[PDB]
Amino acid sequence: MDKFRVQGPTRLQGEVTISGAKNAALPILFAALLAEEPVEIQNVPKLKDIDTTMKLLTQLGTKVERXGSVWIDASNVNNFSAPYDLVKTMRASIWALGPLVARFGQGQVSLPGGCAIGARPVDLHIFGLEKLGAEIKLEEGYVKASVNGRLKGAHIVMDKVSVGATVTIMSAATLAEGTTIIENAAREPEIVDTANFLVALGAKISGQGTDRITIEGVERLGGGVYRVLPDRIETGTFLVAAAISGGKIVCRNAQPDTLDAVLAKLREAGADIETGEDWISLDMHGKRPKAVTVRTAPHPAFPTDMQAQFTLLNLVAEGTGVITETIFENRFMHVPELIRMGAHAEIESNTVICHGVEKLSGAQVMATDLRASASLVLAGCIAEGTTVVDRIYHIDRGYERIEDKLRALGANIERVKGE
């Protein structure tokens, strides 16, 4: 089990190039099942789920290959079933359902142990496709969809905001007969990116980014070249890296408008921030951060995927600050780990009261959540001594070569193979 051995303290400063967002690349890759002509998806990070997705698409009859781009030719897709062995490691596989039923009138995806599709009183993937006219069956370890003819546009009200189901419904609606209006739609930048990709193929969609998305169905989608947007969470992670170490960093290949809440919170912490069309610079001017108040909420509000990172920021800041989760109320496993590194904090209900200390101390730590794990690596960079972060494969799956990026910023980090 690989680990990262980090030697601190080190100021993290310089430049980093932000990779494409896996959370946008995945729905775009599945949306490509709708394309009748070749598609080139650019700026796709090299991460496990991307490979898993390519293997699944191939099984469906898609011709795929990759490098910086992933080239897709779904013209001859002829198998409409995503098997257990190809989906067991990735829940995103559910996104094959909508496109398949919308373009070929049928589809099915295996549901492995731990998969909660159909378990909610109202599963929005199922609800949305049913509203569009599909008949959904949950049988023999699969979720199956079918429709006689084409799907039909409908006014669909999502009873909860769901990025997952918004992608499913929006994607399938592009080939439905008529207009579909999605109310209470997820507003995440990845939804916007998926919508713009579909439009690039010839789809008619408006309202992406707002709580209401309107799709006017078309007979077919063609092809095109589309560049995946920057990973806003990776960006925030590196901005935090500089913010907690007195450094100055410039993030290249970034998209500032996906991070309004995060940048505003860093300014409250004392960061000197500037932005350009494709870059963001953060400069602490050698100063320790000031404690801030953080409250996670649905985009465009402060993102829960940056919560662990800002908890770390508060734990080395001047003053007492509070972290409040309204999305994942017990997403605090990074706290006990940081406490073993000398951090001072109390977890109370859905909040963490942080009492910032001047310097952390190295320890052997581990968190299974991707963002928490990355935060522990950052903590090791600024702590006094040696920090060993275990099970870093979790990071490997969500960040593209974070080791190389941190090293180029000044980190003393080494990947170690099993103890």
Tracing tokens 């980190």 back to the chain, one arrives at: 411
Count of beta carbons in the 10 Å neighbourhood of residue 55: 12
Distance between CA atoms of residues 256 and 307, nearest Å? 18
Asked if 101 contacts 94 with a C-beta cutoff of 8 angstroms, the reply is no
Helices 163-173/124-131 angle, 10° precision: 20
Handedness of CA 290, 291, 293, 297 (dihedral sign): positive
| Alpha-helical regions (H) of 246-353 | 260-268, 307-315, 334-339
23 annotated to bind ligand: yes
Q: Which two tokens stand for residue 97?
A: 């359902």
Q: Which two tokens stand for residue 62?
A: 């898609």
| Alpha-helical regions (H) of 66-188 | 84-87, 97-104, 124-131, 163-173
Cβ neighbours of residue 49 closer than 8 Å, sequence gap 6 or more: 22, 26, 90, 92, 397
Asked if 309 contacts 236 with a C-beta cutoff of 8 angstroms, the reply is yes
369 annotated to bind ligand: no
Whether cis (ω within 30° of 0) applies to the bond prior to 300 is: yes
Count of beta carbons in the 10 Å neighbourhood of residue 196: 18
Using what technique was this structure determined?
A: X-ray
Residues 234, 237, 241, 244, Cα dihedral to 10°: 170
CA distances 53 to 34, 63, 108, 247, 362, Å, are 15, 12, 15, 38, 38
DSSP conformation letters of 205-228: EE-BTBSEEEEE--S-B--EEEEP
Rama region for 345: left / alpha / beta (φ>0; ψ in -120 to 50; rest): beta
Of 108, 325, 327, the residue nearest 335 (C-alpha) = 325
Per DSSP, what are the bridge partners of residue 249? 14, 282
Asked if 187 contacts 152 with a C-beta cutoff of 8 angstroms, the reply is no
Of 287, 294, 186, 299, the residue nearest 244 (C-alpha) = 287
The single-letter code of the amino acid at 409 is L
91 annotated to bind ligand: yes
Q: Which two tokens stand for residue 122?
A: 């109202």
Sheet containing strand 70-73, strands side by side: 63-66, 70-73, 39-42, 224-227
- DSSP 3-state of 23: helix
The CATH code belonging to domain 21-228 is: 3.65.10.10
Domains 1-18+230-418 and 21-228 share a fold: yes
Helices 189-200/22-31 angle, 10° precision: 30
2 annotated to bind ligand: no
Distance between CA atoms of residues 120 and 94, nearest Å? 15
Whether cis (ω within 30° of 0) applies to the bond prior to 9 is: yes
129 annotated to bind ligand: no
Structural domain boundaries in the chain: 1-18+230-418, 21-228
- DSSP 3-state of 417: coil
For 91, phi then psi, to 5°, come to -65, -25
- DSSP 3-state of 356: coil
Of 405, 397, 236, the residue nearest 307 (C-alpha) = 236
Asked if 356 contacts 243 with a C-beta cutoff of 8 angstroms, the reply is no
Cβ neighbours of residue 358 closer than 8 Å, sequence gap 6 or more: 288, 316
Q: Which residues are tagged catalytic?
A: 115
162 annotated to bind ligand: yes
The single-letter code of the amino acid at 123 is D
The CATH code belonging to domain 1-18+230-418 is: 3.65.10.10
Burial of 418 (0-12, 13-18, 19+ CB in 10 A): exposed
| Alpha-helical regions (H) of 61-211 | 84-87, 97-104, 124-131, 163-173, 189-200
